[PDB]
C-alpha cells in the first residue's frame with residue numbers, strides 16, 4: 001500500500017506540472033523583440049505599400 | 051579574465067513556518083461550527099420520521115476515516131449527506147492547492163547579475179558593496195563617466211583590507227563585493243557558501259613583462275603559446291583553481307525539515323494526554 | 337511583466353459560495369422534510 | 379569569406395557598388411568582379427584607418443584555405459602574405475604555433491577556443507525523486523509516533539487487538555485504502571480521529587512539496603571535455619557516437635597533432651561547409667559537433683530551437699585569441715598594438731559586441 | 742455508494758456483492774481516482790495567475 005500511494009501521488013505531480021509550464025507563447029513586445037532582428041518563416045509582418 | 055561580484059549563498063531550507071498557515075483562524079472556527087450545524091440538522095431530521103452516532107458520522111467523513119456504522123434513514127437525510135461530502139472534498143482539495151502555491155512562488159531572491167543590475171543604479175541600505183582602498187579597479191570607475199554616482203555610493207563603506215573583504219561577506223555585514231574573477235573563482239571553491247555572479251565585466255588577460263625589446267621578447271612568447279597549445283595551463287589550473295570542484299546551484303525545491311513541520315506532533319501529544327484526561331470521565335459517567 | 341502574489345493565506349470571501357451552496361442544500365432538505373410530512377395522505 | 383564576422387554582399391543594380399557603412403571588396407578574383415563587405419572586422423578596420431593613415435582596397439582569396447600549410451607551400455589565407463602580395467590580412471583568423479613562425483601577430487582582441495555543440499536533450503526530469511521531498515526527520519518521527527500511539531491505544535483499551543491495531547493504523551496513512559476492521563469503544567475512537575486528521579494533512583503536504591521537484595528540471599548531460607571516456611571510447615559505449623569537424627582548419631591540425639589516438643576515428647566524419655553541420659545536428663544525423671566557439675557562441679543566440687547550446691563554456695580546448703596579420707619584421711606592429719589597446723581603453727568593444735554579438739537565448 | 746465513491750469515497754457504506762458486477766464497480770473507481778487527481782491538478786494552477 002505504501003507503494004500504491006506513490007503512484008497516484010506522482011500522477012498528481014506530473015499532471016500538475018503539465019499545466020504550469022503550459023505556456024504556449026509570449027506575445028511579441030515592441031520593435032526590439034530580437035525575433036525581429038531577423039525573422040523566421042513562421043512569423044510574417046510588414047507595412048502597407050508606400 | 052574579467053571583473054565579477056562575490057555574494058554569499060542563501061542556505062535555502064528556511065521556507066515553512068507552520069501547517070495551519072494557509073487558512074486563517076476564521077475559516078478554521080467557522081467550519082468547526084458548521085460541522086456541528088449539519089450534525090444537529092441531521093439528528094433533528096432523524097427524530098421526525100442515533101444522535102451521537104450521527105454526529106460521529108458527519109464530523110468523521112471530513113477526516114476520511116471510516117469509524118461509525120450510521121447512515122441516513124430518511125430520504126432528505128440522504129439527499130443532504132451527499133452534498134455534505136461534496137463540500138468535504140473541496141476543503142482538502144483547496145488545501146492542497148494553496149499549500150502547493152506557497153511552494154512554487156517560494157522564490158526568496160534573485161542573485162544580483164553583473165554591473166547593470168539596476169539595483170546598483172543607486173543601492174538601498176540592505177545591500178552593501180565596495181572595493182578595496184586604492185584598488186586599481188577604481189581606475190576604470192573614474193575613467194568611465196557613468197559609474198560616478200555608484201562611485202559615491204561605492205565610496206561609502208570601502209573596506210581597505212583586501213584580505214578582509216572575504217571576512218566582510220563572511221560576517222554577513224557585506225554581502226556582495228566587486229573584484230577580479232581569477233581570484234574569486236578560486237575563493238568560492240573553498241566552501242560552497244560563497245558564490246559568484248557569473249557576469250563578466252571587463253575583458254582582459256594577464257601576461258609577462260620585459261623591458262623594452264629584450265633579446266627574449268619575441269622568443270619566449272612562442273613557447274608560452276606552444277606550451278598553451280597542448281594541455282599545460284589547463285592541468286595546472288585544475289591543480290590550482292579547482293580545489294573542492296564544487297558545483298554552483300539550483301533554485302532549490304527546499305525539502306522540508308522536522309524543524310518546521312513537527313508542529314502537528316504537538317497536537318499528537320495533546321491528543322495523547324486528552325486520552326487519559328477523558329479515560330476516567332466515561333467510566334464514571336457509566 | 338507583473339510579478340506574482342506570494343501565496344497569501346485563504347479567507348472567507350474567497351470561499352464565497354462554498355457555504356451558500358451548503359445552506360441552499362440545507363433549505364432543499366427542509367422542503368423535502370415538508371414534502372415528507374405532507375405525503376402522510378397518499 | 380567568413381562566418382558572420384565578415385559578410386559579403388552583391389552590388390546594388392541601381393547605385394552600382396552598394397550602400398553606405400560598408401567598404402567595397404572587388405578584384406580580378408575568378409576567370410574583375412565586385413562585392414561589398416560589411417561586418418565586424420570591417421568596422422574594426424575602419425576605426426583603425428581612422429587613427430592611423432589610409433588603407434588600400436580589398437581582396438579575396440582563391441586558394442580557399444583558411445591558412446593551411448602543405449609541402450612548405452602555405453596555401454590560402456596566410457599563403458598570400460608570405461609572397462608579400464598582401465602587406466597584411468584581416469578577418470576571423472585564429473592564432474597557433476605553426477602560423478606564428480612565418481608572419482607576426484597583433485595583440486588579440488576576442489578570446490576564443492574550441493568547444494562542443496549538441497542539442498539540449500530533454501533526457502531527464504529526475505533520476506530519483508520519490509525520497510527527495512522530505513528530510514529523514516519526519517520519517518522516523520512518524521515511526522516512533524505510531525509505535526507509541528499503538529501502545530497507548532492498547533492501554534486505553536484496558537478500561538485481534540494489538541497486531542490488527544498496528545495494521546489499521548499503519549494502513550491509515552497511505553490513503554487508508556486497505557479494507558480493515560475492529561475499531562470499537564467510545565473512549566479511544568477520538569484518538570484514532572486525531573491520527574486520521576494528522577494523516578490527511580501529512581499526505582497533502584507531501585504531494586504538495588512533491589508537486590515542486592518536477593519544476594526544477596536542471597537537465598544536463600555534462601559530458602566533460604576532450605579528455606572524456608566517450609571520446610576515449612568512441613564505440614565502447616554506444617554505436618552512434620559520431621563526432622564532426624571541418625578539416626583544413628587550424629583546429630584540425632591541433633586536434634590531429636594532439637589526439638591522433640582518436641583522430642583516425644574522426645576522418646569518417648568530415649562534412650562540407652559549416653551550416654551543413656548544424657543542419658545534420660538538427661536532424662540528429664550527427665551526435666556531437668566540435669569547432670571554435672568563436673562562431674558557436676554567435677550561432678547559439680540565432681536559432682529558435684534553443685536546444686542548440688554548448689556544454690560548460692570557457693572550459694574549452696585551448697585559450698587563444700583572434701588577431702590581425704602583418705608581414706614579418708616591419709614597423710607598423712608597434713603602433714597598431716597601441717591603437718587596439720586604446721580601443722579597449724574606450725569600452726567600445728562592448729558596444730560593438732552589442733552591435734552584433736548578442737543572442738536571444740542569452741538568458 | 743456510487744455517488745459517494747467519487748468524492749474520496751470516504752463515507753462508510755455497504756452492500757457490494759456478486760462476482761459479476763464487482764468489476765464494473767472497479768472500473769468506476771479507477772475512473773473516479775483519475776477524475777479527482779486531474780481536478781486537483783488543474784485547480785493547483787488557478788492559484789498561480
Ligand SMILES: *[C@@H]1O[C@H](CO)[C@@H](O[C@@H]2O[C@H](CO)[C@@H](O)[C@H](O)[C@H]2NC(C)=O)[C@H](O)[C@H]1NC(C)=O
Pocket residue numbers: 441442624625626648
Ligand atoms: C581541403 O583543401 C583541399 C584543397 O583545396 C580540398 O581538396 C580538393 O578538391 C578539389 C576539387 O576538385 C581538387 O581539385 C583538389 O585536388 C582536392 N585537394 C586534395 C588535397 O585532394 C579538400 O576537399 C579540402 N578539405 C576540407 C575538409 O576543407
Ligand SMILES: *[C@@H]1O[C@H](CO)[C@@H](O)[C@H](O)[C@H]1NC(C)=O
Pocket residue numbers: 498499500501502
Ligand atoms: C526533447 O524535445 C524534443 C522536441 O520534441 C524531442 O524530439 C526529444 O525527444 C526530447 N528529448 C530529448 C532527450 O531530446
